[PDB]
Structures are given as structure tokens and as C-alpha cells.
Amino acid sequence: QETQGQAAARAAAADLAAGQDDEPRILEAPAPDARRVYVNDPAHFAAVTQQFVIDGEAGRVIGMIDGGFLPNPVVADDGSFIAHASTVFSRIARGERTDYVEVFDPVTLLPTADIELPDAPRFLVGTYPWMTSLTPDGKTLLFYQFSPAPAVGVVDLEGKAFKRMLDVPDCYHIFPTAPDTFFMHCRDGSLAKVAFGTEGTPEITHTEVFHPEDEFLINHPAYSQKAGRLVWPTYTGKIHQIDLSSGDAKFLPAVEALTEAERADGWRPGGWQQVAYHRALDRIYLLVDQRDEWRHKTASRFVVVLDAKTGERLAKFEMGHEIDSINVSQDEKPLLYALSTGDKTLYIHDAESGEELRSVNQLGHGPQVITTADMG
Template identity: 35%
Template sequence: MRLLTLTLFLSLFNLALAQLPPETSSTATLPAWQPHWVFVLDSNFPYLTANKATLLDGDRLDMLGMISMGYLANLEVSPDGKEIYAIETFHSRLTRGERTDVVTIYDAKTLLPLGEIPIPAKRFLVVTKRNVTGLTTDGRFLLVYNYTPGQSVSVVDLRARRFIGEIETPGCALVYPIGPRQFVMICADGALLGVSLDDNGRVRSLNRSSQIFNPDEDPVFEHAVTLGNRLYLVSYKGKVYEIDGSGVPPRLLRTFALPEEGFRPGGWQLLSVHPNGFLYVLVHRGGDWTHKYPGEEVWVISLREGRRVDRIRLVEPANSIYVTQDGRPLLFALSEHGFVQVYGAFSGRYQGRIDEIGISPLVLIGR
């Protein structure tokens, strides 16, 4: 009876399998870029040779797609939302061998590669930071910060699809685009370097300011933000610097302090800015040298008034934040544990969370 029962079961199981339709695969196409979409960059620590970028929808609280990238990659989205640029490094033997650095161009609707632009194999390879690359505000030129340890910036013409040249910037790091032909860099002595390009992407002028902040007494976070021709830096102790980046050289306009109250700014990508004139700062309870602690709250600072106008208490601590640039913005708050919280940026209302987005997500990138 047991043998008969087993034989009957296997016969029915095989019959069910025979009736299953064959599986087929397909490729979905995304609609035009939406204002509440954001990429999360995962450096895949400690397996840094294969990074990824996950595209999230803040309205649906869902994942839309993913781009697989090379070693310690960074990402930029074109101003029109039609193309995505991955700045990547590869080695011929995965962890060794000949090094190749490229800018890979992706179609934003299919997330499939359209082509590559080779660049000098000297870009800054470090745990993912937002400002190791940048786009000029018109989307024409891509800027890539290099460190060998000589410091320079590679310029790529995205319209012509070619590498233009390299600008030597000794003592100054990272890139903060200010306009269609200008960007600012932070220098080791607390000064800022203003760089102007001509219409061919060649350097027109380099102008270095006097010391703006004291890196020995109160360093600034490298994750700064720009709004128009303004650059906003925040120090470890909560001092905000407003810089006119269009000046020759860059010029300090004013400073003001965040409310003390036992809080300090900290995290990773701890700043975001909205066109309505609001600076969002990730903060935590702490003292000196707690600048890497995850944030418990996000403070909303009116740039016009130079004061806090709101505070958003996070459901769970976060390391990075990003505010969308539309009229009804969302605030994304990224945890190192692989999930994103979503809030109304103006209301502070918690919308929900998106889970399981990576091993070591660090940076949020929108358009």
C-alpha cells in the first residue's frame, strides 16, 4: 500500500509539472523620471569590487530597478532625467591587474548601458562620497575628482561623449558645481578654490580664497550642498558657512550657528537643501568628535532667516538624508542597516519605509 501510494503521488506530481507553462523573461521599461525617485548607492562592503545602485519610488515605497556597477562607483543623473552616468573602476583580474576607469552611460528608462567614456585611471577611490563627482548645472560636463596622491579634476564632455582634460588642483579636494561653467573645491588649509571653465571644458581660471574655516579647531563636513551659486558648509560643532561660489575667488557671505541644545550634526550624507530655501541637517545628541554618529532628528533651517523652523524626529536613526526638489518634497532617511524611511519634507509626517535595499548603503542621489 505504501509503494502504491508513493507511486500515485509521484504520478500526480509529474502530471502537475507537465501542465505548468514554461517560464519566460522580459524587460520592463520605466516611465519618464518622477520627482519622488531616488537612487541608493551601496558600496557592498566588504566586497567593494561590485557596487550597485537601487532606484526607489518614495510614493509607492517600492524598488523600481537596479544598476550593477564597478569598484567604489559613483552616480549622476542628467538634469532632464533621461540618462544616468556611473563613474566606475575595473581591474582585469577583479582585485588586481590592469586598471580601467570609465563613465558608463545608462538609459534612464531601461537602465541598460548605452556606451562608455574612458577616463584617466586615477579617480579618488574611497568609501562612497557624494561629491567625488559632479555635473555642471546644465548637464554638459561631468567632473571627476582624482587623487594619486596628486590632486586634480578630470572633465568629461557628456554631449560629445569624450574626455576633455585634467585640471591640476594641488591641496584642494572634491567638486561642488555652482553653475554651468563653475565649481568649488575645499582646500586642506580651510580655503576654497573656485574653478571656471570655458565653453570647451578647458580651465579658464583658478582662484583660491583666504582661509574661511579653521580645520584644526572646527573642521567642516565634506558632504556640503549647493543652491544656485551658494555653497553651504556645516562644521562639526554646528556652524553654517554660506559661500558665494560665483565670486572670484569664492567669498564668505555669512555664518550662523545651529541651536546647541546638546545636539551636534553628524552621520554621512548629513545635509540636503530645497529650492524654497530650507537646509535639512541630520543631528544627534552628542559632544565633540561624535560627527559620525547616526542622526536622531532632522532639523529644518530657514536660509533666509538663518534659524531653525522645524525639527523632524526620526522613527529610527539614519546616516544619510536627501530631500526631493519638487513642490511637495519627500525626505528620505537612509539607515546603515539597509532600509530607507520616507517623510513629508514640509509636514514631517512619516510615510513608511522601504526594506532590504543593500548590505552597506551610504549615499542617496536624486535629480
């Protein structure tokens, strides 16, 4: 019940009363852990943006990172670094464009690499986590390019250098499975496997088509790189699961997040980051509400929870706020993170009971993306 700002007043008065000296200095953030959570604020397309680093357990902002125009955040699963691909202009939003990758130390938040990306190659879009992606060794960053055509840029983080663009087919998103391989989703309804060497055209294999042309897959699937599990809901809440753990795509039985009855009652997923996946529990969390079929980007007030293995519903939580995005911590007794763009606030819930524990407000102008590390 005592707040962080109250306990801080009391510590400060006791220092004063006892004559305890201390040097004003730059703090270090605490060590990355399972309960650290990152909230990116794309700020409704503003030319400059912010990321908040938050301790989920205390509900406290522990630092911030500035970015430019629609940056893509990535966070190494082992906690060793964070990075983003970003874009700046010589006169605010006009003049010469520079795209670049920065790597930051995760406790000092100091840039440890600034890597310029030649010829302004980033895709400028509303933030999708899997349009920029780390390989599982953490040594390579892969970013998507849309113009003039779908391509994928390879950035060597170890040597701090852009390497090359890979030509790909008409495909979207980047799910890395190895130091030299990633998967994308193609317009035609298949996945493409892209295997790449230091030089050469890549080797590209497609799977079979796994969804029909009139089944719409959302912009924000959940991908657990450590499980090799791609969890991909459609506009109706049908959930495709693809196992990438063998290094090849194996398509799991499709699951329905909503019942036939709820569907006919106008229950649909909706929001921004609509789906989360917990690796250890093998569990899928989906933001849903009653809504018209073309209100798919509005906030939702419920989360449904289901067993990934069977598709049985485990819980349905009333969130108590307008929630746009969700994610979960990857430890035992996880937190369920529920971000409201409209409230600019991160609501922090027990993922088991769905109860709200605490919240962090004043998170920028239109915060939308939550990222966690999977450290287990």
C-alpha cells in the first residue's frame, strides 16, 4: 500500500535527518530479469518516439530510450542487449533521411553500436514486432524492406556493419530460426523459408498454402523463438500454429479461440498486439470483444486463455479497461501485460487469476507495443 514515491520521501527524509551523504550521479538500471517489460510509443506517427523500460514487479519506469520515426525495437532473449532500427531526418521530418541500428547496453542504456543502413532501406509502417528480428545467436539483425519490393536486410551486430539486402518473393514478416535461416509469410498463403550465406542469392523454399485467400491473418502474430512456435490468429479468432523447432514448418491442428456460439454473437479478436504466447506453460492469450467485423483495430476488454496443445479454454478475463495490446512475462506465475493506447497506461495483471496488480501511466502519446525477454 505505501507507494514508490512515498517510500522515496521517507528514505530521503531519513538521509537528511541522519546526515547521510550521497553523490548525485547517473543511475544504472537493475539487471535485466523475467519481469522487465518494454513499452514502445510510436506516438501516432510522430517523427520522434520513446521506449519505456519498466520493472513489471514494482510497476516502475527504470529507464527510457529515444527513437526516431516508427522505430522497430528488439530485445535479446538472454538479457544481454536491446536494440532498435530507427530513422531520422536532417531537419526534423524533412531533408536527408538516415536509417540506422543502435544497440544499447541494457543497464547503462548507452549505445554500444550505431550502424548506418545504406539508402534509407527501412519499411515505414505502424509498429509490427516481426518486421525486425534477431537471430537466436543474437549476432544478426534482420529488418524488412517494402520499397521498391519485399526484401530483407542483414545487419552484422558482432562486426557492427550492414552486410546486404536479400531479394525475396511477395512476402511479409521475419521469423528467424537459426543463425542463417528465417521464415516469412507470403501473399499466396504459404510460408517461405529463406536460408542465407554470407554471400549468394538465398535458398528459398515454400511450404504448402495453409490458409485460404478469404481468411485474414493479423499483423501481430506471437512468435517464440525459443519454442520455435508461431501463433497466428485470424480476424475471426481461428488460431494457426506452426512448429518451426525442427528447422522446417510443421502445421499443427488449427484451434478456435472463440466458440461457434460467441462468433455468431459478434465476438472477435481486436486491437494491436492481440495475441500472446507463454512458452513454459504452452498457453495462448487472446484479446477479444463483441465488435463489428471491420472494427478489428479497436481496443478489447476481455482476454481468453487456452491450452495450445488441445485448444481448450482455460479462462476468460474481464480486463476492466480498454486494452489494445497484450504480452506475458516468460517466467513461472507470469504477469499478463495489458497496454491501453488511449489511457497511455500499462496495466499489470496476474496471468493466472487475471486480477490487476498495479499499473504504470503517462507512457508517451500513443503507446502500442510491449516486448519481453524470454530468459529461461
